């Protein structure tokens, strides 16, 4: 099941992300249930907003909010909820609800050459970055959250390493 997916081939450089919400989909927030590995409807979002990238998590990690590290993964076409994609981290958007750090990872080079030039957080389209920051600032307006800024691939991997160790 999804409960058995590795954290990655070569942490923190090569990770696997379990997808819960596809890019641009209807406002249904799903989550993988730790008990059955099944896709559960977590909530219907109240705002008229959509996730700008595919949203998921790295299995076998645990951050301080007691949840697995969340990653946002841009792809050329929306992915299937419950699917797994191999990626490499490039940045982290730090915020506070606690501390939520949503990493941004791009598809691994073996899946597509389209993201090869993206190696660090400032290599990502500025508009993509404002749109992601804006979504997190505002998605729970009708349900608090504060963006504090972006950080590089080094910080992202530090976050992966720490959460993985913390999961052990």
Residues near a copy of itself (CB under 8 A) = 1-2, 4-5, 18, 24, 26-28, 30, 33, 35-44, 46-52, 75-86, 107, 110-114, 125, 127, 130-131, 134-135, 138, 141-142
8 Å CB contact between 159 and 101: yes
Q: Is 100 flagged in the annotation as binding? A: yes
Handedness of CA 125, 117, 62, 31 (dihedral sign): positive
Closer to a copy of itself by Cβ: residue 18 or 90: 18
Q: Is 70 flagged in the annotation as binding? A: yes
Least separation in angstroms between residue 49's CB and a copy of itself is 5
For Cα atoms 47, 24, 21, give the angle at the middle one, nearest 5 degrees: 85
Least separation in angstroms between residue 158's CB and a copy of itself is 26
For Cα atoms 150, 154, 159, give the angle at the middle one, nearest 5 degrees: 80
Closer to a copy of itself by Cβ: residue 99 or 143: 143
Q: Which two tokens stand for residue 71?
A: 């990653």
Least Cα distance to 109 among 89, 87, 124 occurs for 87
Q: Is 139 flagged in the annotation as binding? A: yes
Closer to a copy of itself by Cβ: residue 64 or 141: 141
Least separation in angstroms between residue 147's CB and a copy of itself is 12
Strand, coil or helix: 100: strand
Least Cα distance to 46 among 134, 139, 144 occurs for 139
8 Å CB contact between 2 and 32: yes
Q: Is 65 flagged in the annotation as binding? A: yes
Closer to a copy of itself by Cβ: residue 133 or 158: 133
8 Å CB contact between 106 and 159: no
Closer to a copy of itself by Cβ: residue 74 or 91: 74
Q: Which residue ranges are tagged as binding site for Mg(2+)? A: 65, 70, 100
Q: Which residue ranges are tagged as binding site? A: 29, 43, 55, 65, 70, 100, 139
């Amino acid at each position: 099941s999804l409960l058995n997916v590795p954290a990655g081939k070569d942490l923190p450089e090569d990770i696997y992300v379990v997808i819960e919400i596809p890019a641009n989909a209807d406002p249904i927030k799903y989550e993988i249930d730790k008990e059955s590995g099944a896709l559960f409807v977590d909530r219907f979002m109240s705002t008229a907003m959509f996730y700008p990238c595919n949203y998921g998590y790295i299995n076998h990690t645990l951050s301080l909010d007691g949840d697995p590290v969340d990653v946002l993964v841009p792809t050329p076409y929306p992915l299937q909820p419950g699917s797994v994609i191999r990626c490499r981290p490039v940045g982290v958007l730090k915020m506070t609800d606690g501390e939520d750090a949503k990493l941004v990872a791009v598809p691994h080079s073996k899946l597509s050459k389209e993201y090869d030039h993206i190696k660090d957080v400032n290599d990502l389209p500025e508009l993509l970055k404002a749109q992601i920051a804006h979504f997190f600032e505002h998605y729970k307006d009708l349900e608090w959250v504060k963006v504090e800024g972006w950080e590089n691939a080094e910080a992202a991997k530090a976050e992966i390493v720490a959460s993985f160790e913390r999961a052990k």
